[PDB]
Amino acid sequence: PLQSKVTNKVYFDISIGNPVGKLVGRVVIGLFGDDVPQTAENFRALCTGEKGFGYKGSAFHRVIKDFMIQGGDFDKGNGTGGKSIYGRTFKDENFNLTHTGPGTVSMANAGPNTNGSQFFICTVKTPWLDNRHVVFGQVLEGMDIVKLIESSETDRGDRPKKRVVISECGELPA
Amino acid sequence: SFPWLTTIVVLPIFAGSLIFLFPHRGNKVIRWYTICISMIELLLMTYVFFYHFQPDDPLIQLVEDYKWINFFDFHWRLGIDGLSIGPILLTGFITTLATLAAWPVTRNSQLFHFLMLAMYSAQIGLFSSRDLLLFFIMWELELIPVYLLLSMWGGKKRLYSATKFILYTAGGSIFLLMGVLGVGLYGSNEPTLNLETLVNQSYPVALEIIFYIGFFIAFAVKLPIIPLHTWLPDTHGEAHYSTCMLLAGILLKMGAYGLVRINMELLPHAHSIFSPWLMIIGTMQIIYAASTSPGQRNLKKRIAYSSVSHMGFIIIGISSITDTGLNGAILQIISHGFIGAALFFLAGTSYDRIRLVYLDEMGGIAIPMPKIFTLFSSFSMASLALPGMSGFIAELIVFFGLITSQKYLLIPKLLITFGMAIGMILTPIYLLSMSRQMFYGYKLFNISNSSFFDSGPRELFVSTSIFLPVIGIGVYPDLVLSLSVEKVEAILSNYFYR
Amino acid sequence: QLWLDGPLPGLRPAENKIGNEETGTRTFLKKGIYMANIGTKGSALRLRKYAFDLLAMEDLIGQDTLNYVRRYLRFKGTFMYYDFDKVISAAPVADKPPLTNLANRLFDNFEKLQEAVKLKDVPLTRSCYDDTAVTLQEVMNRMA
Amino acid sequence: VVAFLSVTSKVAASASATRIFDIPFYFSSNEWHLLLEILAILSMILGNLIAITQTSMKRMLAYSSIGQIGYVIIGIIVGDSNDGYASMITYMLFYISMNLGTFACIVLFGLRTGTDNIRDYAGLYTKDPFLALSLALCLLSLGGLPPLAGFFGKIYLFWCGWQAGLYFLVLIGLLTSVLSIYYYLKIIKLLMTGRNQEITPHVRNYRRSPLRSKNSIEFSMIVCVIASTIPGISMNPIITIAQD
Amino acid sequence: LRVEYYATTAEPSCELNLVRSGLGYCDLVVGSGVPAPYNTLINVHYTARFSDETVFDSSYKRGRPLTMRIGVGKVIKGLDQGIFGGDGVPPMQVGGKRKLRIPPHLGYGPEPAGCFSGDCNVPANATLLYDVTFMGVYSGNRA
Ligand SMILES: CC1=C(/C=C/C(C)=C/C=C/C(C)=C/C=C\C=C(C)\C=C\C=C(C)\C=C\C2=C(C)CCCC2(C)C)C(C)(C)CCC1
């Protein structure tokens, strides 16, 4: 079940392939803007691209099977880039939300008060990430696409061998 | 079960590789062996078309699939349909007749006939290739034979023409290779180059447009499209007339065949985007070449610009999205392959006697040479879109395909219909003038030109054997159209709402 | 506007219920055929003329020329289908049911003839074409 | 010796460059990637442009070698993921035969003739058709002409470049390969001159002699390779993607 | 101070088995492979964080596991004791995942490391945290 009501709705268009990916489906993410306003606003603004920079053309740069997919690095694409709409980093809001299971979209940070533009979608229950990562969304549609991204073959690191690229990101009004 | 198409492709080049085992001098044994190979291959294609090709089948036929390279997922894949069998038969016919008409060649006859058989094999391999990289390889496999034929048996400016030809074709074909790489790597799981599975592929609009541009640059370099046509006048004007048969009858149609097979079939959305801009380009190409032709004093350059003008009707039939337009484009392909080759052959044979180039000094040739005058006049009439010939019915069917087209509404349908009409006013204006500057009038010729000067039995047979199908198609066009009415419909089936 | 932007329009559905009950359209219809817009009188004249053209198809029926029978049947069938739709849509309300019934019978005969052609059965083709022939004669008698 | 330094020096230096840019310098890939991209683009551009203005055969082959090395550099640039090092070999294996054949023909021609200028290569087809045929085949393989080894080697090198998203590198490689036809065709254009007035006296007094000689065997082990490896480009890569 | 920003999700927590040398460790995953051999090159994956859980280094950042000769003092003493073992620490096995808390005297000591151009990578007297993962023993050929 959903931990909170969905205020704003965002969606991704996932493309897998090399060098130009083929579209595989749509991933719809509902944002819990009531509990975490700043993080949800940051994610929505990066999805729409109103600030100039956004998730369009970015890639899911870290995939661990049966654990998590992680992306949101439009700057460098290796995990060392990404800026929020406020600054380079912004403070962790609060940790009332919990990694309740698959489809949980949370913030990936270098540490406390170091949230940026990088997010990760969990595919299993991760109760060890609570009080350390800001959970701000839930995947509503396209979980099969998320599992398809997870099943991608990976190199010696965790980068997928085939580039999983977000072709077009935005909002779906409801 | 038997590999018919593989045997057809392999046989000419494999037989020509053995032409160097002959220790004989001269050209007699070499040319008779080459014509034996050409006629055996022609009979083989005739057997294939008679017994294993079904014109009512819109699917691929006689397919053969052998995996050659695993990394590219690259297969030697061959297959024929209603689109390819016409060009294949035309290739065999024109190449055999060009081998027959290249008989006075006594300098390096072995290499000449080997290159002719290699050209045979390469053209047939292109026209029956169902793999994108195999298509690209067979496309590239003619840069060297045509270069050698031009540079060793051409005219006065043969070397510059050969260099320009090979550099222009390489410049187009690198864009062809980029398009091949882009289309063959779009697969999400594994690369694929088979045309059958690529005909169902779905692309975004921008990527489809980019791939279409990458293929269209190559197909506009090969099939002469303004302004990528500048290699053709000096390439065809300064080439051997036997090589001019293949250049103006077979190699020019390869760009159109690639346009139907790849641009029209594999990428229909980008083709629908680009076709209205192709119509204006084709009409301006007709007008531009039909106006450039009177400005050429050279006879062969005038014929080459006439070929550029005649390619505009093929471009129009391609861009007009109807079954009738595509049928007219195929009919014009066959008609031009029957007309331009014979015109170049007659020009070369006439030059072998008169030994003059510019039209303002070749008066009175009709007095010592009446039969070549008759053949030249008849093939000019065929060029003139005269009824009873294939050119008239091809242009008429292209006009009907434009008039019946649903993509364009009224005013462009007028301004294009008027457009090519201006072309068939300009097409007489030089052509008859050409004849008037090449055969009419009186000149005092030598007594030795009274006998053993006209066309012999061989040249008469060649001209008659290319002229007869022109009349046979101009009387009954469905001798050709019935081979491709079905498959063209399938090609059109992707252009409507689904 | 100069040219259409999207894909070309397909088979426009008839608004007189002359199509097949299960599918809403007939099998012999071909997309991409140019039909000239004349009106009810011109559609009636073309309907009669093309019924005569299809009754001129006895010679084409044979073991070797069934594909041309199918091609001519599809071409003329699309033409008379849309002409019949045009003339029923402009007919008086009292005359619409008999015209619709005649069109339905004619198009069922067209489907049966095409089905017989597909199996390459010549006596079946001849019998279906005889039924089509009496229906076409009825069509020209009605629309003279 | 220059043929040896053309084939042996590039193999060892390519191995050292691959083992010094991947094993101890993988953390700074974004720097030596740019360095190698500049080093390759400049190499093809300034090795194929100057080779078309050469009057000496060995110097033209030098500019040829410094042009073909840029194609191999793309294999390092793409990396081991999208094949890559498997495209360094299966092209260096090609390149060895291409250069050693096109240098063996030069060795025999110079020994029987006594010259190095390209203008003295005119009319060799009339004197020695076998040597002219072999040299033409080696040069056409050097230009990436279709039925010969260089064409498949270049499309293998460009497939991995396109797969890695290096459109600029592949485009420059294709444009420089187009430029790389005018030479490797100029020599053939000289070789097929039947004009006795343009034939240098260097080849007029040319004796082929009725003996085989060792270089003929050495380049018959080569000319039959650069043409008949074109089907066998599936046996070679499965030995080169097996390494990692 | 000169911390390169790397966004990585955290690892499961532990109870730290403190030893005589001051090192703390836990076995997140006990490896089923060969234990870390002495004087041998091994590839491991690590995520080096400072105190206050801020990551300053990671082998995932470079894209491949780090190769080091273990057991002969080519790394800091805390990493050697965590991986190779000894002094109450069992050796790690192939496939094993282990957390490590290196005190300052087992790390870089009271001297900052990587000092150049007005900043240093590691501050003085810093306790380091390592989520090491023994990927395997080094081999010339990969699968
Ligand atoms: C497409 C094709 C083809 C086919 C074709 C055909 C199908 C044909 C037919 C044809 C026909 C079925 C015909 C009929 C008839 C004819 C006639 C009847 C003729 C006559 C003529 C005459 C008598 C004369 C002439 C002349 C000459 C020769 C020249 C000069 C001028 C004149 C005109 C005088 C081929 C195989 C080639 C191959 C390729 C493809």
Coordinates of C-alpha atoms in Angstrom, one line a residue, chain B residues 17-448:
Chain B
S17 CA 38.7 -15.7 -61.9
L18 CA 39.6 -18.7 -64.2
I19 CA 40.1 -16.5 -67.2
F20 CA 43.7 -16.0 -66.2
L21 CA 44.4 -19.7 -66.6
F22 CA 44.1 -19.3 -70.4
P23 CA 47.5 -18.9 -72.0
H24 CA 46.0 -17.9 -75.4
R25 CA 46.7 -14.5 -77.0
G26 CA 44.3 -12.2 -78.7
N27 CA 40.7 -11.9 -77.6
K28 CA 38.8 -14.7 -79.5
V29 CA 38.9 -17.5 -76.8
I30 CA 38.5 -15.0 -73.9
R31 CA 35.5 -13.3 -75.4
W32 CA 33.8 -16.5 -76.4
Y33 CA 34.4 -18.0 -72.9
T34 CA 33.0 -14.8 -71.4
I35 CA 29.9 -14.8 -73.6
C36 CA 29.4 -18.5 -72.8
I37 CA 29.5 -17.7 -69.1
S38 CA 27.1 -14.8 -69.5
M39 CA 24.6 -16.8 -71.6
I40 CA 24.7 -19.7 -69.1
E41 CA 24.1 -17.3 -66.3
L42 CA 21.2 -15.6 -68.2
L43 CA 19.6 -19.0 -68.8
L44 CA 20.0 -19.8 -65.1
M45 CA 18.2 -16.6 -64.1
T46 CA 15.6 -17.4 -66.7
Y47 CA 15.0 -20.9 -65.2
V48 CA 14.8 -19.3 -61.7
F49 CA 12.3 -16.7 -62.9
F50 CA 10.3 -19.3 -64.8
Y51 CA 10.0 -22.1 -62.2
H52 CA 10.7 -20.6 -58.8
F53 CA 9.4 -17.0 -58.9
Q54 CA 5.7 -16.4 -58.3
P55 CA 4.6 -12.9 -59.3
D56 CA 1.4 -13.2 -57.2
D57 CA 3.4 -13.6 -54.0
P58 CA 4.1 -10.4 -52.1
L59 CA 6.5 -12.1 -49.8
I60 CA 10.2 -12.9 -50.2
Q61 CA 11.1 -15.9 -52.3
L62 CA 14.0 -18.3 -52.7
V63 CA 15.5 -17.1 -49.5
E64 CA 19.0 -18.4 -48.4
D65 CA 20.5 -17.7 -45.0
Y66 CA 24.1 -18.6 -44.0
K67 CA 25.6 -17.0 -40.9
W68 CA 29.0 -15.5 -41.9
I69 CA 30.0 -13.3 -39.0
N70 CA 28.6 -13.8 -35.5
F71 CA 29.6 -10.4 -34.0
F72 CA 27.5 -8.3 -36.4
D73 CA 24.8 -11.0 -36.6
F74 CA 25.7 -10.8 -40.2
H75 CA 24.4 -13.4 -42.7
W76 CA 24.8 -14.1 -46.4
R77 CA 21.1 -13.8 -47.0
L78 CA 19.6 -13.8 -50.5
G79 CA 16.0 -13.4 -51.7
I80 CA 13.9 -12.2 -54.6
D81 CA 10.5 -10.7 -54.9
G82 CA 8.5 -8.7 -57.5
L83 CA 10.7 -5.7 -56.9
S84 CA 14.1 -7.4 -57.5
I85 CA 13.5 -9.9 -60.4
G86 CA 13.0 -7.1 -63.0
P87 CA 16.3 -5.4 -62.2
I88 CA 17.9 -8.9 -62.0
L89 CA 16.7 -9.9 -65.5
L90 CA 17.7 -6.4 -66.8
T91 CA 21.1 -6.7 -65.3
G92 CA 21.7 -10.1 -66.9
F93 CA 20.4 -9.0 -70.3
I94 CA 22.3 -5.7 -70.4
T95 CA 25.5 -7.3 -69.1
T96 CA 25.4 -10.1 -71.7
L97 CA 24.7 -7.6 -74.5
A98 CA 27.5 -5.3 -73.2
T99 CA 29.9 -8.3 -73.3
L100 CA 28.8 -9.0 -76.8
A101 CA 29.2 -5.4 -77.9
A102 CA 32.7 -5.1 -76.3
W103 CA 34.2 -7.5 -78.9
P104 CA 36.6 -5.1 -80.8
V105 CA 38.5 -4.7 -77.5
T106 CA 41.9 -6.3 -78.2
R107 CA 43.9 -4.4 -75.5
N108 CA 43.9 -6.3 -72.2
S109 CA 40.9 -8.4 -73.1
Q110 CA 41.4 -10.8 -70.2
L111 CA 41.2 -8.2 -67.6
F112 CA 38.3 -6.4 -69.4
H113 CA 36.2 -9.6 -69.5
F114 CA 37.1 -10.5 -65.9
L115 CA 35.9 -7.0 -64.8
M116 CA 32.7 -7.4 -66.8
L117 CA 31.9 -10.7 -65.1
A118 CA 32.8 -9.2 -61.7
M119 CA 30.3 -6.3 -62.5
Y120 CA 27.7 -9.0 -63.4
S121 CA 28.2 -10.7 -60.1
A122 CA 28.2 -7.5 -58.0
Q123 CA 25.1 -6.1 -59.6
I124 CA 23.2 -9.4 -59.1
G125 CA 24.4 -9.7 -55.6
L126 CA 23.1 -6.2 -54.8
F127 CA 19.7 -6.8 -56.4
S128 CA 19.2 -10.0 -54.5
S129 CA 20.6 -9.2 -51.0
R130 CA 18.4 -9.4 -47.9
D131 CA 21.0 -8.3 -45.4
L132 CA 21.9 -4.6 -44.8
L133 CA 25.7 -5.1 -44.5
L134 CA 25.6 -7.6 -47.5
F135 CA 23.7 -4.8 -49.4
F136 CA 26.5 -2.4 -48.4
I137 CA 29.2 -4.8 -49.5
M138 CA 27.7 -5.5 -52.9
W139 CA 27.2 -1.7 -53.2
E140 CA 30.9 -1.2 -52.6
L141 CA 32.0 -4.1 -54.8
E142 CA 31.9 -2.1 -58.0
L143 CA 34.1 0.9 -57.2
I144 CA 37.2 -0.9 -58.5
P145 CA 35.9 -2.6 -61.7
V146 CA 34.3 0.6 -63.0
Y147 CA 37.4 2.6 -62.1
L148 CA 39.6 0.2 -64.0
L149 CA 37.2 0.0 -67.0
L150 CA 37.1 3.9 -67.1
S151 CA 40.9 4.4 -66.6
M152 CA 41.9 1.7 -69.1
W153 CA 39.2 1.8 -71.8
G154 CA 37.7 5.3 -71.5
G155 CA 37.9 8.5 -73.5
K156 CA 40.2 11.5 -73.5
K157 CA 39.4 12.6 -69.9
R158 CA 39.0 9.0 -68.6
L159 CA 41.4 9.3 -65.6
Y160 CA 39.8 12.5 -64.1
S161 CA 36.4 10.9 -64.7
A162 CA 37.4 7.7 -62.9
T163 CA 38.9 9.6 -60.0
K164 CA 35.8 11.8 -59.7
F165 CA 33.5 8.7 -59.9
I166 CA 35.3 6.7 -57.3
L167 CA 35.7 9.6 -54.9
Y168 CA 32.0 10.6 -55.3
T169 CA 30.8 7.0 -54.8
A170 CA 33.0 6.6 -51.7
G171 CA 31.7 9.9 -50.3
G172 CA 28.1 8.7 -50.7
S173 CA 28.8 5.2 -49.5
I174 CA 30.3 6.3 -46.2
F175 CA 26.9 7.9 -45.4
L176 CA 25.4 4.6 -46.6
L177 CA 27.6 2.8 -44.1
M178 CA 26.7 5.2 -41.3
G179 CA 23.0 4.5 -42.0
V180 CA 23.7 0.8 -42.0
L181 CA 25.4 1.1 -38.6
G182 CA 22.6 3.2 -37.2
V183 CA 19.8 0.9 -38.4
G184 CA 21.6 -2.3 -37.5
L185 CA 22.5 -1.2 -34.0
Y186 CA 19.0 0.1 -33.0
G187 CA 18.1 -3.3 -31.5
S188 CA 17.7 -3.2 -27.8
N189 CA 18.9 -6.8 -27.2
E190 CA 21.2 -7.7 -30.1
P191 CA 22.2 -6.1 -33.5
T192 CA 20.2 -7.2 -36.5
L193 CA 20.6 -6.6 -40.2
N194 CA 17.9 -8.7 -41.8
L195 CA 15.5 -6.6 -43.8
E196 CA 12.5 -8.8 -42.9
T197 CA 12.8 -8.1 -39.2
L198 CA 13.8 -4.5 -39.9
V199 CA 10.6 -3.8 -41.9
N200 CA 8.6 -4.0 -38.6
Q201 CA 11.0 -1.8 -36.6
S202 CA 9.6 1.4 -35.0
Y203 CA 11.8 4.5 -34.6
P204 CA 11.3 8.0 -33.1
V205 CA 10.7 10.7 -35.7
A206 CA 14.1 12.4 -35.4
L207 CA 16.1 9.2 -35.5
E208 CA 14.1 7.9 -38.5
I209 CA 14.8 11.2 -40.2
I210 CA 18.5 11.0 -39.5
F211 CA 18.7 7.4 -40.9
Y212 CA 16.7 8.5 -43.9
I213 CA 19.1 11.3 -44.6
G214 CA 22.1 8.9 -44.2
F215 CA 20.6 6.5 -46.8
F216 CA 19.3 9.3 -49.0
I217 CA 22.7 11.0 -49.5
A218 CA 24.1 7.8 -50.9
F219 CA 21.0 7.1 -53.0
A220 CA 21.2 10.7 -54.3
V221 CA 24.9 10.3 -55.2
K222 CA 24.3 7.1 -57.1
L223 CA 20.9 7.8 -58.6
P224 CA 21.5 11.4 -59.9
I225 CA 19.6 13.9 -57.7
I226 CA 20.3 17.6 -58.0
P227 CA 22.9 18.8 -57.1
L228 CA 24.7 15.4 -56.5
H229 CA 24.9 14.6 -60.2
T230 CA 28.1 16.2 -61.3
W231 CA 30.1 12.9 -61.4
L232 CA 27.7 11.5 -64.1
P233 CA 28.4 13.7 -67.1
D234 CA 32.1 13.3 -67.2
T235 CA 31.9 9.7 -66.0
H236 CA 29.5 8.5 -68.7
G237 CA 30.8 10.8 -71.4
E238 CA 34.4 9.6 -71.1
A239 CA 33.6 5.9 -70.6
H240 CA 33.6 2.9 -73.0
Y241 CA 30.2 2.4 -74.5
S242 CA 30.0 -1.2 -73.4
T243 CA 30.7 0.1 -69.8
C244 CA 28.2 2.9 -70.5
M245 CA 25.5 0.2 -70.9
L246 CA 26.1 -0.9 -67.3
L247 CA 26.6 2.7 -66.1
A248 CA 23.4 4.2 -67.6
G249 CA 21.2 1.1 -67.6
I250 CA 22.0 -0.8 -64.4
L251 CA 24.1 1.2 -62.0
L252 CA 21.8 4.2 -62.2
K253 CA 18.8 2.0 -61.2
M254 CA 20.6 0.8 -58.1
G255 CA 19.9 4.0 -56.3
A256 CA 16.2 3.8 -57.1
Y257 CA 16.2 0.2 -56.0
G258 CA 17.8 1.1 -52.7
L259 CA 15.3 4.0 -52.4
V260 CA 12.4 1.5 -52.7
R261 CA 13.9 -1.3 -50.6
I262 CA 15.3 0.8 -47.8
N263 CA 14.0 4.4 -47.8
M264 CA 10.4 3.6 -48.9
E265 CA 10.0 0.2 -47.2
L266 CA 12.1 0.2 -44.0
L267 CA 11.4 3.9 -43.0
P268 CA 7.9 4.9 -44.2
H269 CA 7.3 7.8 -41.8
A270 CA 10.5 9.6 -42.8
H271 CA 9.7 8.9 -46.4
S272 CA 6.3 10.4 -46.0
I273 CA 8.0 13.5 -44.4
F274 CA 10.6 13.8 -47.2
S275 CA 8.5 12.9 -50.3
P276 CA 6.8 16.3 -51.0
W277 CA 10.2 17.9 -51.0
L278 CA 11.4 15.1 -53.3
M279 CA 8.7 16.0 -55.8
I280 CA 9.9 19.5 -56.3
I281 CA 13.5 18.3 -56.5
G282 CA 12.5 15.7 -59.2
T283 CA 10.6 18.3 -61.3
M284 CA 13.4 20.8 -61.1
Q285 CA 15.8 18.0 -62.0
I286 CA 13.8 17.2 -65.1
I287 CA 13.7 20.8 -66.1
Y288 CA 17.4 21.4 -65.2
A289 CA 18.8 18.5 -67.1
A290 CA 16.5 19.0 -70.1
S291 CA 17.8 22.6 -70.2
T292 CA 21.5 21.5 -69.7
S293 CA 21.3 19.0 -72.6
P294 CA 21.0 21.7 -75.4
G295 CA 24.1 23.4 -73.9
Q296 CA 26.3 20.3 -74.3
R297 CA 28.2 20.2 -77.6
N298 CA 29.4 16.7 -76.8
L299 CA 27.0 13.9 -77.8
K300 CA 27.7 11.6 -74.9
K301 CA 27.4 14.4 -72.4
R302 CA 24.0 15.3 -73.9
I303 CA 22.9 11.6 -73.5
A304 CA 24.1 11.6 -69.9
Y305 CA 22.2 14.7 -69.1
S306 CA 19.2 13.1 -70.8
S307 CA 19.6 10.2 -68.4
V308 CA 19.6 12.7 -65.5
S309 CA 16.4 14.2 -66.9
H310 CA 14.8 10.8 -67.2
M311 CA 15.6 9.9 -63.6
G312 CA 13.3 12.7 -62.4
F313 CA 10.2 10.6 -63.4
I314 CA 11.5 7.8 -61.2
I315 CA 12.0 10.3 -58.3
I316 CA 8.4 11.6 -58.8
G317 CA 7.0 8.1 -58.8
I318 CA 8.9 7.3 -55.6
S319 CA 7.7 10.5 -53.9
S320 CA 4.1 10.2 -55.1
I321 CA 2.8 7.7 -52.5
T322 CA 0.6 5.5 -54.7
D323 CA 0.9 2.0 -56.2
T324 CA 0.6 3.5 -59.7
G325 CA 3.5 5.8 -59.1
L326 CA 5.8 3.0 -57.9
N327 CA 4.7 0.9 -60.8
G328 CA 5.5 3.8 -63.2
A329 CA 8.9 4.2 -61.4
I330 CA 9.7 0.5 -62.0
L331 CA 8.5 0.7 -65.6
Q332 CA 10.7 3.8 -66.2
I333 CA 13.7 1.9 -64.6
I334 CA 13.2 -0.9 -67.2
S335 CA 12.6 1.6 -70.0
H336 CA 15.7 3.7 -69.3
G337 CA 17.8 0.5 -68.9
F338 CA 16.6 -0.4 -72.4
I339 CA 17.0 3.1 -73.9
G340 CA 20.1 4.7 -72.4
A341 CA 22.3 1.6 -72.9
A342 CA 21.4 1.4 -76.6
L343 CA 21.8 5.2 -77.1
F344 CA 25.3 5.0 -75.6
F345 CA 26.1 1.9 -77.7
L346 CA 25.1 3.7 -80.9
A347 CA 27.1 6.8 -79.9
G348 CA 30.2 4.7 -79.3
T349 CA 29.9 2.7 -82.5
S350 CA 29.3 5.9 -84.5
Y351 CA 32.3 7.5 -82.9
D352 CA 34.4 4.4 -83.9
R353 CA 33.8 5.4 -87.5
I354 CA 33.4 9.2 -87.6
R355 CA 36.0 9.9 -84.8
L356 CA 34.4 13.2 -83.9
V357 CA 33.1 14.5 -80.6
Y358 CA 31.3 17.8 -80.8
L359 CA 28.0 17.9 -82.6
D360 CA 28.7 21.0 -84.7
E361 CA 31.0 19.0 -87.1
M362 CA 29.2 15.7 -87.6
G363 CA 26.9 16.5 -90.5
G364 CA 25.9 14.1 -93.2
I365 CA 26.5 10.8 -91.4
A366 CA 23.2 9.5 -92.6
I367 CA 24.6 9.1 -96.1
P368 CA 27.4 6.5 -95.4
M369 CA 25.7 5.1 -92.3
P370 CA 21.9 4.8 -92.8
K371 CA 21.2 1.8 -90.4
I372 CA 22.8 3.5 -87.4
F373 CA 20.8 6.6 -88.4
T374 CA 17.6 4.5 -88.3
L375 CA 18.4 3.0 -84.9
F376 CA 19.4 6.4 -83.5
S377 CA 16.2 7.9 -84.6
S378 CA 14.1 5.0 -83.2
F379 CA 15.9 5.2 -79.8
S380 CA 15.5 9.0 -79.8
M381 CA 11.8 8.5 -80.4
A382 CA 11.8 6.0 -77.5
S383 CA 13.6 8.7 -75.4
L384 CA 10.9 11.2 -76.6
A385 CA 8.1 9.4 -74.7
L386 CA 6.6 8.4 -78.0
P387 CA 3.6 6.0 -77.7
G388 CA 4.4 2.4 -78.7
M389 CA 7.5 2.7 -76.6
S390 CA 8.0 2.0 -72.9
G391 CA 9.0 5.6 -72.1
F392 CA 5.6 7.0 -72.9
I393 CA 3.6 4.5 -70.9
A394 CA 6.1 4.9 -68.0
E395 CA 5.6 8.7 -67.9
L396 CA 1.9 8.3 -68.4
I397 CA 1.6 5.9 -65.4
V398 CA 3.7 8.3 -63.3
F399 CA 1.4 11.2 -64.3
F400 CA -1.6 9.0 -63.3
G401 CA 0.0 8.1 -60.0
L402 CA 0.5 11.8 -59.2
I403 CA -3.1 12.7 -60.3
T404 CA -4.6 9.8 -58.2
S405 CA -2.4 10.6 -55.2
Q406 CA -4.1 11.4 -51.9
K407 CA -1.2 13.1 -50.1
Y408 CA -1.2 16.3 -52.3
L409 CA -4.2 18.5 -52.7
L410 CA -5.0 20.4 -56.0
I411 CA -2.5 23.2 -56.5
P412 CA 0.8 21.3 -56.1
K413 CA -0.8 18.5 -58.1
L414 CA -1.2 21.1 -60.7
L415 CA 2.2 22.8 -60.5
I416 CA 4.0 19.4 -60.7
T417 CA 1.8 18.1 -63.5
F418 CA 2.6 21.2 -65.5
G419 CA 6.2 20.8 -64.5
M420 CA 7.1 17.5 -66.1
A421 CA 5.0 18.6 -69.0
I422 CA 7.5 21.4 -69.7
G423 CA 10.1 18.6 -69.7
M424 CA 8.4 16.8 -72.5
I425 CA 8.6 20.1 -74.4
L426 CA 12.3 20.4 -73.7
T427 CA 13.1 16.8 -74.4
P428 CA 12.4 17.1 -78.2
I429 CA 14.2 20.5 -78.3
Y430 CA 17.7 19.0 -78.0
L431 CA 17.2 15.4 -79.1
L432 CA 16.0 16.0 -82.6
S433 CA 18.5 18.9 -82.8
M434 CA 21.1 16.3 -81.8
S435 CA 20.0 14.2 -84.8
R436 CA 19.8 17.3 -87.0
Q437 CA 23.4 18.1 -86.0
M438 CA 24.5 14.4 -86.3
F439 CA 22.8 13.0 -89.4
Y440 CA 21.1 15.7 -91.5
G441 CA 22.7 17.7 -94.3
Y442 CA 25.2 16.8 -97.0
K443 CA 28.9 16.1 -96.7
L444 CA 31.3 14.6 -99.2
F445 CA 32.5 11.4 -97.7
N446 CA 35.4 9.2 -98.8
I447 CA 34.8 6.3 -101.2
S448 CA 36.3 3.8 -98.6

